[PDB]
């Protein structure tokens, strides 16, 4: 499917919820919203890093230790 580039807000968040490696929700007025991130899609790559199969905490660590600009590929 597709590749979405987002920018962390002033709280360090791009604006989505996930569980089991899949995006379940998008936050109103967020970079995920503005950039067209879609729910019910599995996350494949974050900043060039394959996250298929990683635990949610490992994904969350990648996202939290990423810089301001976060690019995610989804399927």
């Amino acid at each position: 499917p597709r590749t979405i580039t987002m920018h962390k807000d002033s709280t360090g968040h791009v604006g989505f919820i996930f569980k089991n490696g899949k995006i379940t929700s998008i936050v109103k007025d967020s970079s995920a919203a503005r950039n067209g991130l879609l729910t019910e899609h599995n996350i494949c790559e974050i900043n060039g890093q394959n996250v298929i199969g990683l635990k949610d905490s490992q994904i969350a660590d990648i996202l939290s230790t990423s810089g301001t600009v976060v690019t995610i590929t989804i399927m």
Binding site: H13, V14, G15, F16, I17, F18, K19, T24, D56, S57, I59, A60, L63, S64
Partner: peptide, 5 residues
């Protein structure tokens, strides 16, 4: 156990 990013 959902995560916010």
């Amino acid at each position: 156990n959902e995560f916010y990013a």
